[PDB]
Design a protein around this nucleic acid. Structure first.
Lengths: 136, 131
RNA sequence: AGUUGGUGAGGUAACGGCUCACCAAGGCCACGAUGCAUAGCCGACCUGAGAGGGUGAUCGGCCACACUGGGACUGAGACACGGCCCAGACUCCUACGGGAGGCAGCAGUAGGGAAUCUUCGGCAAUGGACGAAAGUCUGACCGAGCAACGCCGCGUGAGUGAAGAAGGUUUUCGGAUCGUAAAACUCUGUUGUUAGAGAAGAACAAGGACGUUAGUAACUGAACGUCCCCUGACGGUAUCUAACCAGAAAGCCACGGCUAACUACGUGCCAGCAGCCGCGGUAAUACGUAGGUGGCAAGCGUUGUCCGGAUUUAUUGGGCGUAAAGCGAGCGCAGGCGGUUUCUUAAGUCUGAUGUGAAAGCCCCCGGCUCAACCGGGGAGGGUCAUUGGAAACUGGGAGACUUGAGUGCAGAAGAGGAGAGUGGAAUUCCAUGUGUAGCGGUGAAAUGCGUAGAUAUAUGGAGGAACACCAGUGGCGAAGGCGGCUCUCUGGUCUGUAACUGACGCUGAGGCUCGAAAGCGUGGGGAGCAAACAGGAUUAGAUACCCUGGUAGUCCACGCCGUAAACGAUGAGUGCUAAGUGUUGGAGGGUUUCCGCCCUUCAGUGCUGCAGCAAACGCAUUAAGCACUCCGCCUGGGGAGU
RNA sequence: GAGCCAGCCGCCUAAGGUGGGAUAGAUGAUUGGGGUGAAGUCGUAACAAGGUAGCCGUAUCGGAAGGUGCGGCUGGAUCA
């Protein structure tokens, strides 16, 4: 546009979004207040754990667990690794990361880091999945 | 309404050069003559001659060509167009194509090229490039 | 509504609506008042080619608060961080009448949270408070302690060592690789352990003697000079020397493409993986283990956040024919931008001197710790700053002069440009009458229907409303929507000629105002054809549709209303420049001339072909979508939704 | 005696009570539309002239997709 127009026009931008809102709590104590808390994780209680089915063209039975974050917002997360110990009423941590072959979940918990037990067999990439090195 | 005549002069030269004919007529005035002069010393314009009747006009300009039929002046461009005038201080003097070109500035002591500015530590308003 | 100004008084370190009495109605707002919402500000740090963007934790400067809200006293200095008085919530003690209290000081505790330490030593130095001085106080501070949290330096050994020991893994069973890797021998001690040696941080007040110089009647002293004398939390810490040992000291991610690094065995659209492409249903370099390989290494990965790559907000640095995007079109206040020339001024512009831009940072030079972080000295950088001196081209301000832009005069030309008032013929239909006999009309085929209360046909006349056959043409006019029978009254705009006249009076134009196809609404008329809705007849599996026979609002007129189209050339407006050829509407000139029938020059519209140039191609090209300036409008993945 | 003080009175105002309004957020029988879902029942508007050329505005109709009427466009094949 003519320079005189931008003089009399702001010429704004298109501020971006976030990929994990529940990690920036909409505060709740004592008086239910606003957000500055962009943590790298939070925690919650497993309100129920089950399996669900993905979308085409994949095929599996993904294992998930619905949780309730401390900041009073509901979230349905995912659990990695082969097998687990999660059941109803269990505290666990939440690590931010999306999973695409399944819709509705954009967080998944971290293995071994809390009440949840680490995977019990892996021998190659035990950093993730929280498995302590085998010392025979 | 003709609201910027120096731009018109440059555009006329660029047109008449791109099609490759040889002469050119423009209504004359103060500064157009001066930039014509400047463009003549540098080995860009073959020759000019001033003719006037009762009004503006008319600077006739005979273009210049290479012996092997190739154009010497290769482009043209105005800088401090109206609506947004452009000035430059002595430690900012532009320098087109690492010397192979020139630019033309309106110092408080006249209209000169750019090297002539840096050899004097002056600023002013820049008219146009050429190379 | 003390708001704004004034007169007067009172008051304050101090001017003043700071406060009072009187008087007058002012003040600020589109250059964003008022309101709502978020944040303490700066030196700086992070990123970036750079313009910029994002953060204001350690260190320095300022402002503001002390359980929440009020008030003042003492004082030079407070409306006072461990001060006082009142009200309020909370904790504690009573003999019930009444009292006490505030870690957002240094440590520690509970709570919250993904997450952040010792209830340590000491005034030896530096700094403060009081004191004549010794001195006392100093959780300021100096040190010690914890945490791979960050950055920097150094080890977990080195030389010789093969036809490849054992073993793994694999194999066409021949071997290949782990691999000089191991072994074996020759060495070293940064490290570790031990035993000795072992500082810099300390300069001093005080006290002794000894002078000099001012002042006295004089010396006690003062203000400095010379010497003895006096003190370490760290701590036997840093550090040196001698001895001994290859001995106590390597994990982490990854290997399909982006991307560096491949093969077995296992499972078989299950388990599972992934940042994105995507892998997994019987021979998987993508899933799991194994063995190899590659990248880093006392670290390595995952998450979260900011900048980059993003030219994806385009000032540097983007676009609007069909991809998202020119408002439907005009009139125009405010604003943005402006023809040519003389003199002038010096706001904008360039340039010179001075002040100033704290210290620590980034950078440059130099220097000190065995080097490096780190520390030290010295220099630049940053203003759009303030004062003061110059130059006069550009833009702006003042006094001028011009005529090409604009406009007016004079002379001519064309037109379905608009409003009002009347008027013409052809056609369809209803009506009146004469003739006239059984059908008409409709379809792909049929039916519904009108007819023997005489139909269709045919002839004469009457009535009524509506649209204007031929001329009609890629013709005309209008800003766009649009305007075609004829005549009259009122009325706008455009074009060519001349060159009388004013002297830049121009262009564009957010908010505002005007116009605005068809459908639609209101009030009153009018109603021939045609026709949504509706009815009947047909086709069809079904047909509330296409086909047929009827038919209501509407279509027309007057005055109001609404304000929308694929309102299109999907192409904003002004202005100037860049090859040609070909028709056509309206002109003005020049030759031939009966030119009023040719030929030549030129102005204005209006079509087709085509060169440079442009375009992602399709194509556009003096009627640019080429080259350029000014002013406006609009756009930034597809859905959600013009909700 | 002057002067001063305790006590009493007066203006100013924090917390408190009452009243009519302003404004932001949870929450509620029932309800309106949207997106997604593996295989549902119904029909076949658009893409070729998609078997009645499509599209846009507008009024009416109808289980729905859509039909119909007026005005407009070519980004309509075919065609003299």
């Amino acid at each position: 546009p003519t320079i005189n127009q931008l003089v009399r026009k702001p010429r704004k931008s298109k501020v971006e979004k976030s990929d994990s809102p529940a990690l920036n709590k909409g505060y709740n104590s004592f008086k239910k207040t606003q957000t500055n808390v962009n943590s790298p994780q939070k925690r919650g209680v497993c309100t129920r754990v089950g399996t669900m089915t993905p979308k085409k063209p994949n095929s599996a039975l993904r294992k998930y667990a619905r949780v309730r974050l401390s900041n009073l917002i509901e979230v349905t997360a995912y659990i990695p690794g082969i097998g687990h110990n999660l059941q109803e009423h269990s505290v666990v941590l939440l690590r931010g990361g999306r999973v695409k072959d399944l819709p509705g979940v954009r967080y998944h918990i971290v293995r071994g880091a809390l009440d949840t037990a680490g995977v019990n067999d892996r021998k190659q990439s035990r950093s993730k999945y929280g498995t302590k090195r085998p010392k025979a | 309404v003709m609201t910027d005549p120096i731009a018109d002069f440059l555009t006329r030269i660029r047109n008449a050069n791109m099609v490759k004919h040889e002469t050119l007529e423009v209504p004359a005035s103060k500064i157009k003559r001066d930039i014509a002069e400047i463009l003549k010393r540098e080995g860009f314009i073959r020759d000019v001659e001033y003719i006037e009747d009762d009004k503006q006009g008319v600077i006739r300009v005979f273009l210049k060509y290479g012996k092997n039929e190739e154009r010497v002046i290769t482009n043209l461009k105005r800088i401090s167009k109206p609506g947004l005038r452009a000035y430059v201080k002595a430690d900012e003097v532009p320098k087109v194509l690492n010397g192979l070109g020139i630019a033309i500035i309106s110092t408080s002591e006249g209209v000169i090229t750019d090297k002539e500015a840096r050899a004097k530590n002056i600023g002013g308003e820049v008219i146009a490039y050429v190379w």
